[PDB]
């Protein structure tokens, strides 16, 4: 039970960490990586958090 | 029961567990080769060749 609470929380905090990056890229602030689109870079970060999350 | 194989209760099998029926249908016809020359369903025997 408490470990499931912790898991739910790890996915929840990783969900907000994605939103922050989604709204950041929607206000053009988010600087694109070298040799990558603003989208290519946005997605890389998103797919990273969502995997970091699952792994943790 | 190792590696995707299993043990089965024989005392259960006896009682009719997982027991199935099976049927096979064999079919035939008296073919007509030309006219009046017909095949015949009979119990054949040693008659010439």
């Amino acid at each position: 039970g408490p470990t499931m609470r912790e898991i739910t929380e790890t996915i929840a905090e990783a969900k907000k960490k994605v939103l922050d990056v989604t709204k950041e890229a929607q206000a053009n602030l988010l600087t694109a990586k070298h040799g990558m689109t603003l989208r290519e870079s946005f997605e890389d970060n998103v797919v990273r958090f969502l995997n970091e999350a699952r792994d943790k | 029961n190792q590696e995707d194989s299993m043990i089965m209760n024989q005392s259960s099998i006896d009682r009719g567990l997982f027991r199935s029926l099976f049927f096979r249908s064999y079919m035939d016809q008296e073919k007509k080769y030309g006219m009046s020359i017909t095949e015949t369903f009979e119990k054949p025997q040693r008659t010439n060749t």
Partner: protein, 92 residues
């Protein structure tokens, strides 16, 4: 009576669909930890509602118990063994 409509993929493009009716209709003004993590009905633009999500499944997959609790290809495999099975195919 016009309570139910037929929609193809071409028409699906111009609609929004609610999964469950209830779970996807009122608004927010506790939760069971055992239950799954479902999304929301924040859409007020809902044009249609899905009769039941389980109708996305065909004959073979519809026989699988709790298929939402299995790794997807495992479900695709039992979709083929259901054919190598036995029983009464008809009463005649």
């Amino acid at each position: 009576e016009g309570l139910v409509e037929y929609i193809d993929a071409e028409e699906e493009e111009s609609i929004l669909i609610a999964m469950q009716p209830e779970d996807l209709e009122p608004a927010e003004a506790d939760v069971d930890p055992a239950k799954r993590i479902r999304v929301s009905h924040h859409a007020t633009t809902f044009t249609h509602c899905e009769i039941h999500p389980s109708m996305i499944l065909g004959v073979a997959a519809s026989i699988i118990p709790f298929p939402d609790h299995n790794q997807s290809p495992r479900n695709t495999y039992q979709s083929a063994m259901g054919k190598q099975a036995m029983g009464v195919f008809l009463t005649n």
